[PDB]
Ligand binder design. Structure first.
Ligand SMILES: *CC(=O)Nc1cccc(C(=O)NC)c1
Lengths: 235, 179
């Protein structure tokens, strides 16, 4: 992740991210709605950070430092490039929706009034089909990935040393190869919880309440198909 | 420092996300309680042993029976959560959660946790539960459930008042260390 985006979401909430004098001019319900929206983007930033760790630090590190069959790397980190491209476009669209909302002469004060359309475009049509088909793949290969890792760690002393070396920095304390895989698998089940809590504080504009309701039913439709498309592969 | 994995299972609004956020932040969030919990690796020293404890949540996976079991691999301790202000969430402990946690995690120590214990002395909770001919889960019913499901132990806590929270995660580490 980039420094600009890290500081923009370094705060524990939206009410702490903006200036205190800017927050004081808004109704409590607006603050409660923006707090949950901010959390959706903050956790989408952490999700893309996790995918970038798998692709650039683990997956890439293994190809250049260790010399193992590239198919073993494909089995260790399945559909990661595709998942990276899917969420980086989503984070890109979420971050520009925040920047458009910025108060003139400020880099921290903003009020996102339209979010629904963005969620509908993401969780519908070809994007939902590509995401459903990618998450179903990832989750079917999830167990085989954890096993293949445990095997490589219990047999290879150079792979054991590589994992000790890359995961030494404190920033990666909760971000090992296995934590990253479950982190990704659990991401899709977060969206309904986040979209339902945004929807709960979005009964101000009717077209917004209907867009957030359509996106809520659209995420659950995706999750139900992802759940129906899982067939666990053995090692 | 040994690495042991903790997973918290339980019904929808049983308070497992709140419990996890409160413990990982030491305090109850004053300005904003987050909707989701990603993961946390906690440094716990119990009885003179230093352990690194990964914390995981099954919140959001309750409806997706093919996705949910992907949380279970390599689990060393299970926290089976239920809410004290919802006697119907305890009914699903031996019917729904125990058979699943025993199928995917055989021999893994389970601690039955009674969350929201403060709500026992709540007027609004005692009122709404009485309207359905009910009352908050009594400690004897929690102990009797932990006994019937063959749990390692029974513990009560309150994510809101933080009472009992530190004692659960230390005990979870003691169970995870048992081989
Ligand atoms: C964009 C911008 O100037 N926002 C802002 C920040 C602090 C305070 C105010 C304001 O209107 N105070 C009366 C606006």
């Amino acid at each position: 992740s980039m420094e600009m985006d890290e500081k923009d979401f370094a705060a524990d909430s939206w009410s702490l991210a903006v200036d205190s004098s800017f927050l004081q001019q808004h109704k409590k319900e607006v603050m409660k709605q923006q707090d949950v929206i901010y959390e959706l983007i903050q956790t989408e930033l952490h999700h893309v950070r996790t995918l970038k760790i798998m692709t650039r630090l683990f997956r890439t590190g293994m190809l250049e430092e260790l010399h193992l069959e590239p198919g073993v790397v494909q089995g260790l980190f399945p559909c990661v490039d595709e998942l990276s491209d899917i969420h980086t476009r989503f984070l890109s669209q979420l971050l520009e929706r925040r920047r458009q909302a910025l108060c003139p002469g400020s880099t921290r004060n903003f009020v996102i009034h339209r979010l629904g359309d963005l969620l509908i475009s993401q969780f519908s049509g070809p994007s939902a089909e590509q995401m459903c088909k990618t998450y179903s793949e990832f989750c079917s290969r999830h167990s085989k990935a954890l096993k293949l890792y445990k095997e490589l760690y219990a047999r290879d002393k150079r792979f054991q040393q590589f994992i000790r070396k890359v995961t030494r920095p404190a920033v990666l304390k909760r971000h090992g190869v296995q934590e990253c895989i479950l982190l990704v698998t659990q991401r899709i089940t977060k969206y309904p919880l986040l979209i339902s809590r945004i929807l709960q504080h979005s009964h101000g504009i009717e077209e917004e309440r209907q867009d957030l309701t359509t996106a809520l039913g659209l995420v659950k439709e995706l999750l139900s198909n992802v759940d129906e498309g899982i067939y666990q592969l053995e090692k | 420092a040994i690495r042991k994995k903790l997973v918290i299972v339980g019904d929808g609004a049983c308070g497992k996300t709140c419990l996890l956020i409160v413990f990982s932040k030491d305090q109850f969030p004053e300005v904003y309680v987050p909707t989701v919990f990603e993961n946390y690796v906690a440094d716990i020293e119990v009885d003179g042993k230093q352990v690194e404890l990964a914390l995981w949540d099954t919140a959001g996976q309750e409806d997706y029976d093919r996705l949910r079991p992907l949380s279970y691999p390599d689990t060393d301790v299970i926290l089976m959560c239920f809410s004290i202000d919802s006697p119907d969430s305890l009914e699903n402990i031996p019917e729904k959660w125990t058979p699943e946690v025993k199928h995917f995690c055989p021999n893994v120590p389970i601690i039955l946790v009674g969350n929201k214990k403060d709500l026992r002395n709540d007027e609004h909770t005692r009122r709404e539960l009485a309207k359905m001919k009910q009352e908050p889960v009594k400690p004897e019913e929690g102990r009797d459930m932990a006994n019937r499901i063959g749990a390692f132990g029974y513990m009560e806590c309150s994510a809101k008042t933080k009472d009992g929270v530190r004692e659960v995660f230390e005990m979870a580490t003691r169970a995870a260390l048992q081989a």
